[PDB]
Design a protein around this ligand. Structure first.
Ligand SMILES: [Cl-]
Ligand SMILES: [Cl-]
Lengths: 361, 361, 93, 341, 81, 93, 341
């Protein structure tokens, strides 16, 4: 075991470079986990892999706990690890080793009050698989008193939750004929459902500059076939929902938009959100401003551990981490070095701020 | 227009033979509709195609209405129309020209009290398409006071509604390896979800001889693929639900049965049921017994117009018609001549019995 | 930046719109230009998504196959339009 | 800093036939990222890196895809062999280096594009730019003009497909019908283009494949034909002609682009001429036989546009495609002088 | 020979576009009995000719159909196929 | 003649023309030499294009199965010709 | 009432090659329905019609599928030509007619099955019966025994597939390797079966197809082999041998069934012998070279089982497969006498 180092000595950029170097696509996080556990042990954590091989390092003492829930796995492939002009390139730099590195460093820097624990987790199998990491935590651990999810929100952004998701299927069957008028074929019928639904979504969210407060549709697949007697067509559509539009609402519109076809629907994700007024949000808004930032409340579009531990534990929860999420899963995924340390300072205060709330009780 | 004939003269077997002769797969019901409208006009109905080309014939007078909602379309193909040993073979004999023929004859035989209308409908596009017939009725007509759906229940059976339907998708992704132990591959994982879910359904409905009061699963599709790094698998499963097992209940079990995979779910049909104690049920139970039968309360498994006008109008509703529903969509679809006239006598009384309830008010 | 099925559906809308704009007010189909989306199929192999639309263009006398094809070709933004001529409209006095 | 030559072999060593450009694009972007470009692939898979700041943009549009065939990547006495050495990784590498070397005014940003699918009929790499980008103020197409050459234009392109069916019984074979169609098409083009000086002004059909097959009860035959068009003969006109020679079979046509040419006295031309001339060269203005993405972005954008790059275009698509390494250094410096002006 | 009878036989032989030979055969067989010189041409077109002279009247129809088969039957005066 | 397919087609055209020129002035088909292009196939591997033509000849006694090959051979300036002599003509005196 | 001959041409006129039995099955059931059977197709598509009442069941198991090839359906002086006239629509039609003609005791039900896929290796038509039905008290297999013949058994069947790959460079061709494998297999079987009297007791390999192809960089070759086994050589044993001769290639094997034979002195045999003899015939007990669904339902069910039907088995799968119409009438009456006893 390495000698104890200063939590202030190691920078997040330093830790991230080492962490981004080790390959860890989902299912193969073991060398990355071992390495990080060693690093955390050197920073004052008590670090060791749990039952599912998640990297877990703890600080503090007491009946109260702040969990920082990140993931150590990535999509496969190697983004050529390089640092050029104050920008770090590497797989997982944004999704989500950057936020994970920030968790480790800020957690070791943060001043804790008595009666407060701090558990930092580098979960496995979140990216390509069914999150064996987080599900193991739920099945084996008590619900902590606060959860910060390690996902890129930007250093000056704070994520309160995620948009709802709905998978739509429109299907239509029509008898064959020779006609070439409108709605003559099943494919035309399926295509026009897309247009009229696409039109509605634009109607609903007119003028809304907050993209996560819009309902945005997607035609993932359209197919058609015929047996000479009948023609059939199917349109598969994804709907990403703002908080003010429930699935069953959106599903009712789609259903009402279809006449000659039938619409079926799966709710992939119910919408989920920690309220703006909540203490944990107050802490992070305060933390960002305390370090010279103009904080933005936002929602994640894509799924994450927030989709699981949120509904499970029901505790106050936010997502925070440096990096531009648009760079997730990209061949040149990168993050500026400044944003890393800035987010580290902010999270340091936020952990202190949350621990202060919890200790006041 | 043909000369008025006696409603007693024409038998249901006579009408059905003529009706089963004319080809009418969904979308091509026009010659069948024209013919039936003529026949109904001869039987005392005022018969004429409506907006969607549905065959509609009315009797009686007043502010109250009993609708007999059947369909005139079938699946394509010709079952060689023949009568052998008191059995009528033909496409739609059971699904559902038999019940439709019974509707026409019994409706013209039935004694109506004052203030009661009787509308018999041979709807179109129910079988292969999205029920343009019934949807047109809903959009253009007032909700009637009672509805009988023309589907095969057997002459001595009465259908109170239908089972709920749930479409399940289990998906799993696992990293490739060389191992051959249990749960080594995604396909094995998908297959074992099927087994454990199939096992549960059997556990839930143990000893239940009422099949429609059981939860019965179906593996419609199982597929798998690999990119050399990861293996994926998908199992598509249908779940037919008894009334005492809601979708979200069954969806919760499936979700709980899956660990390494994720289950998504679409509710195809919410379960629906007219209660056993209701007046319309009392009428039909009475009608069957009045003509020497031991009535069976049952539910339809497959979808029908009952799935639409039921939730729409919300009026008391049953499904009744001669024929064995297991013969639906079969190359030798057939019905015994005795069952036709027996069901005709029963429905005649049932219409009178319902009209009596309605008139008493 | 979005899907192949969306791009193919985008092409159909453009063509459908154009033909409809051309054909306004005309009572007889023979003197109208009407498209027919006979098939629209998308697929995904994990690497590239692909979409193929099969369309029949019915032509009135006032619109030559050469012109229609030229129009169809110009409507495609990122896709690839492939065309085959049967015959132009023909009538006898 | 890296020379164009060290950049070229690295790119040439990474196979990128049309459809398989991803690893090449991926690698090229990090080479652009290491060099200081803000660089990632775009929505279509194009390799994109952009320089400078502001609302004014010069685009260096090259292509990273190549035709198939394995040309052994090697250096033989200052001569680099490899698929793409001329067409067109050479010009593309030149874009990456000269694009960084040059110094720009404020408000002027430079963008390097390694487009996908230029070699094939889709040209969807360029088409994605037309769909998703604002028109730049000028464009340089990355094709081999020669270190002392300036290409002002390329011929248009239409691909033709003839298919014919004949019963496998009694009464011309599918092959004979297909061949005679080719004979008709070849003759029509030859009689049209008779006595014309340069390839640019001629219409030339190309029989890339003819294959007859026996279905079982039918005889089948297909002919894959590329057609290269001069300004005088539009794709539309050429298809009408092709249609009129079909007879017993059917002709399926897919338009790439009409011919395109940059007017000889353009300021952007003068800039390159000077860059050539001032660097001790004797420039010859060229119009090429093949086609280019210039033929698409030209009529689309309308900005001043030329094609420039190291390499002899006659070596395009050849089994031993190669370029002298000396040509690379000059072309980079010349493009730079050109870029500045 | 009646038209409805020939058609009743004609519609009983499936001939989707590209698979016409059986129907073409049968038809050539029938036209001869009516006075034609019948023979499938180099393309497979059923061709029946009668008479001779400088002039010619061609009755040009088609034997192929779109796929999807309508069960062949006559009901209430109407032929389905 | 820049592709393999173009050369095979050209060999066929020139062979067909030669036979027709020879067979001119001849009364009956069984006295003419008749060429039949049974097949024509082409391929490419990126480096080389290849093509192959299957041409049948029906020979009258006035043209030998040896003079036929030699003529075909001389027409192949760039290509190569191989030949299968199934049978020469026979004619009872 | 309809004779077997009028029934046969109708069935023979409806093509039913393996995989395409539905219209034939569909039509046959209405013929069974018109004749008074409770008749519909089952879960696998078998044509099923059943007679009588009770817990005791005789099954007339025939098959409605045929091998491909169009045999013109015609009658030439009392001789019916057509694919399936012998194998095995003749016996199946005989089952339908004799099955209705006979009179049964109470508690005894008769069932006629026109199974699918008997001709091919799947035999899934019969396999569905094994999976979804209770074992009958006796079975008659619908294969051509001849009007005065009684088939007691058939050889087993194993299909073999040899595949070999060779690089298209330098050093035996794929074809040569595949051919030599066949040579080894053919020799092993011939040396095993040397001097054996009848086909039933010999092991005989069948080279149904050998095809070599050029992948591009590899030479490829595949050999489709059917293997017919005597009782002495099990499918298991025969596969082990086949495996041991693979050498450079691989052998893929699919078991149909082992050989099967009905013991000569069975009461069910006596019943048919009598039916033959009493109807003025000179019965010859036969054991056939090919295989049957008897080989599956036999070992599965274990009930008394024989094969009977009009037709000469040598005409099986031939371009002019045919049966004398006279043979049909006798076979129907003989089967009836047999059925009763
Ligand atoms: Cl010129
Ligand atoms: Cl022996």
């Amino acid at each position: 075991m390495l000698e104890s180092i200063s939590p202030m000595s190691m920078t997040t950029a330093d830790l991230l470079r080492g962490l981004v170097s080790i390959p860890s696509p989902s299912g193969a996080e073991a060398p990355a986990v071992e390495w990080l556990c060693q690093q955390m042990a050197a920073l004052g954590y008590q670090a060791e892999p749990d039952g599912a091989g998640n990297a877990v390092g703890t600080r503090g003492e007491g009946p109260r706990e702040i969990m920082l829930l990140g993931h150590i796995d990535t999509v496969p492939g190697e983004v050529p690890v390089q640092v050029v002009d104050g920008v770090l390139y590497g797989r997982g730099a944004v999704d989500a080793k950057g936020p994970l590195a920030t968790f480790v460093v800020a957690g070791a820097r943060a001043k804790l009050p008595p009666g407060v624990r701090l558990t930092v987790v580098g979960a496995v199998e979140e990216e390509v698989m069914s999150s064996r990491g987080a599900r193991h935590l739920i099945a084996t651990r008590e619900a902590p008193d606060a959860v910060v999810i390690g996902e890129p929100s930007g250093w000056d952004g704070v994520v309160l939750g995620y948009r709802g998701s709905v998978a739509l299927e429109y299907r239509v069957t029509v008898p064959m004929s020779h006609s070439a008028g409108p709605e003559a074929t099943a494919a035309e019928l399926a295509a026009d459902f897309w247009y009229r639904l696409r039109t509605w979504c634009a109607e609903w969210s007119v003028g809304i500059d907050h993209a996560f407060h819009r309902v945005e549709p997607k035609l993932n697949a359209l197919n058609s076939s015929s047996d000479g007697l009948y023609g059939e067509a199917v349109a598969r559509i994804g709907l990403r929902l703002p908080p003010a539009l429930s699935p069953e609402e959106a599903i009712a519109v789609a259903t009402s938009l279809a006449s000659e076809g039938e619409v079926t629907a799966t709710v992939n994700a119910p919408a989920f959100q920690t309220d703006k007024r909540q203490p944990i949000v107050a802490a992070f808004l305060a933390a960002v401003r305390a370090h010279g930032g103009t904080p933005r409340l936002k929602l994640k579009t894509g799924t994450s551990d927030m989709n699981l531990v949120g509904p499970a534990w029901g505790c106050p929860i936010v997502a925070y981490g440096p990096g531009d999420s648009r760079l997730d899963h990209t061949p040149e995924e990168h993050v500026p070095l400044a944003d890393l340390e800035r987010a580290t300072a902010i999270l340091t205060t936020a952990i202190e701020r949350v621990a202060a709330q919890i200790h006041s009780g």
